[PDB]
């Protein structure tokens, strides 16, 4: 069969496909959730401009992983993507949380592809997800609970100014 | 009659010259507002900044509508203009409400004149609306919109404090 | 009432508003001064942009007028603005001719409105139009005179030859 | 048939062939009155160089025409091209007076083809002429009717005189 | 319901919304035509990135569609998006030609949504597509047009060959 | 008649006016040339190149042709242009057997005007000749003569891949 393939099990090939999946589910989903503040009853332009960024972030990664799966010797499968979870994502609160739920959920996928490639001997894997997606989701997670921290703070018994004053002066505007 | 007349109806001269006079009695609102916002008992500078650069930019419109006129070989017609509806203008709530409802009445002028054009077969009027209007006027009220969202949500139950928030850290100041 | 206003008397205020009208009006009969010009069967570049200039001119004494009339704690009150004079302005000469008339008429505004600051004891707004207003006026009306003496010396029994010169070798044109 | 073509009638197909051949057939006409006006027994450089200019715009109008034929996947076709009108153009307003009609034939040729596009459900021809054509020739006829206007004011007793001037002053001399 | 929104039907904003799915869809099978082109058994560099191109210009119509759903003050709704029609898109020309069946899809939604908005009178619409869309899509289509000719013309008795030649010495490349 | 015309033939002035219609009437066949290189299911750009270049030159030399006409107070006259003599232009090998063709009677007309202005004895006719047309043209023959070797050398048993090499390699394009 393939001419460069060596030491890449079929269960890592099928699994790194899987991942790609997730990514852009991911990235779909943060270009959901750009859009929806965007609109101008929602109207928090740091927001926006937070979850397009993640967008092209998990766009990245899984364009990292299409790379590897080819510089390996596996064939790249892509399926259907499921649209996102929600098509109104409510406060940036609530949108925050919903991010830091899927970032575990990539985070998981991450670890078990990891524990994978452990298992099957398969030490360019492993240390490609070191080098490239461990030390960037953690990043990420705790980006976001900082924020969601500060997010919190703000709430108070003036939701509405809170949200504002969050967007103005944590998030990036323009 | 004319030299240079081609394709222009007497409806389109005519209401060419009536947009005229709304986009002017739009300028003369907006310099109003923007000096109420200047008084020392209102005091909000973005405020009065953005309604200013609103009447240069209403007065601009006019400009091109009487430049089309003249390349066109029709005359340009001048009638008396009507002062503001209004000679105080309430909150930046207020004011920015005002400022839709003009701005909805000015885009739905262009889209009437639009719909002549299009009836008279005068590509050359479509054109030039869509080119230099019809876009310039849907991001306009977008962001009229996206103003409006974020005044709103900082009135709570301490609408100075958001009225002086919105102009520091949303308008133009510096 | 005012928290600043000092000095400023109410017949001040009053004339001060009605002299805004009076430049705001000015400006208007030179924006259709130079759409006149503009005219494909009238043609004249450099008289088209003089009367611009004017247009401009005419706007920025109305707004440093507003302005002062919130420095000093007065209230900014709109009216409607006519019309001007004439639809169309026959020659340039013709239309120079009203715009001295046109300009003696600002100026006598402007010194009436210095008596009344006179009598009134106000020597803010005396000074304020001596600073802004009254040398600009004199020396407007003074290169307005030059430009009359030319055009007449022009005329001849060659109209259109002297009119053509006059706009190509005195007005800037591109 | 064409690989490419797509929602491209037979009748705009043959229409741009013979648009094309309109604006050859004006920039050959330009060709002769450059050349007329460069004859050492008419010597009106400024002229010259004015009808020059003309005939590289309208080379460049049927050029950009068959380029857009061939993304469209129509098949450009030649025709023989009539000479001129006149081998001689008599004075500067003679020349000028032609060349408005000229242009107003070109136009008149975009509206119809226009109306075609429309009739046709031809969106692309029909932002492609509103685009490249519509306001490029309203704009050219606006600069022939102030150059008549002129050339006429000057004729008065003294045409030798006037036609001088004009080619002086106002036309480009280098 | 909206504060900005004017003269946008629910026919309009729906059919925007599937276009942008039809576009995504695009981007997607382009990003699966770019890493086939990148796999070690087919290794033709200048074709993996002609449609990694075309996966990024897909996604950026997209993108604009949404940010216009915003602007005219419609509600972006994402579907699921379905796997490209393809898992293997053997020989350059194979690929080229899924392509042109692919972009004519686009050009004919797009054409068909274009005769909506006329419909439905809506010039912004209409306007947007002409200025973004139509002549993009065309200027494509002629650029894949050329190239299936050039690689039609490589064939010859010697697949292999012409294959390599095309990709080295048309498209960009490392 | 002419203040300017001295040793200037009838029999000259008007053969310079035939070779203004042959170069116009080459300057069209290169047009028509390079917009069949420039179809779709033609689409080779270095050829199209080559022949526009050749039409703009050809162009050139009419006008130099028609100014000399002027300078020697000659009267330029313009005739209908003929249409080229194909509306399709075969292989790239066919069009450069037409071009070299076509540039054999062009250089033909030049050395009978050179005689033409020998036995007339007109020594600024003879010198404009060699000076700005004998020699290009002779080097434009060589090139043409070089270019079919080349073509000719890569048809082999392979025409369209000796097409594409010679269009990419020595043709400019990109
Ligand atoms: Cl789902
Ligand atoms: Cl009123
Ligand atoms: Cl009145
Ligand atoms: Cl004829
Ligand atoms: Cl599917
Ligand atoms: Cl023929």
């Known amino acids: 069969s393939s001419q460069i393939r060596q030491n890449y099990s079929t269960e890592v090939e099928a699994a790194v496909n899987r991942l ?5 589910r991911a990235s779909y989903t943060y270009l959901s959730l750009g859009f929806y503040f965007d609109r101008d009853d929602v109207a928090l332009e740091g927001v926006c401009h937070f979850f397009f960024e993640l967008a092209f972030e998990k766009f990245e990664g899984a364009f990292r992983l299409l790379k590897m799966q080819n510089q390996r010797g596996g064939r790249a499968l892509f399926q259907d993507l499921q649209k996102p979870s929600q098509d109104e994502w409510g406060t940036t609160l609530d949108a925050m949380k919903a991010a ?3 970032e575990k959920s990539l985070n998981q996928a991450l670890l078990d592809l990891h524990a994978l490639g452990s298992a099957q001997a398969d030490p360019h894997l492993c240390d490609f997800l070191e080098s490239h997606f461990l030390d960037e989701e953690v990043k990420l997670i705790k980006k976001m ?3 969601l921290t ?9 939701a ?6 969050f967007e103005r002066l944590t998030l990036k505007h323009d």
Chains 1, 2, 3, 4, 5, 6 share one sequence.
């Not at 790609?20 to 852009?24: A, M, P, W």
């Not at 500060?150 to 003036?158: A, Y």
């Open 145 to 147: 609970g900082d924020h």
């Open 100 to 102: 830091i739920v899927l």
């Open 150 to 158: 500060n997010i919190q703070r703000l709430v108070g018994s003036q």
């Open 20 to 24: 790609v999946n997730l990514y852009l």
């Open 160 to 165: 509405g100014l809170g949200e504002y004053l």
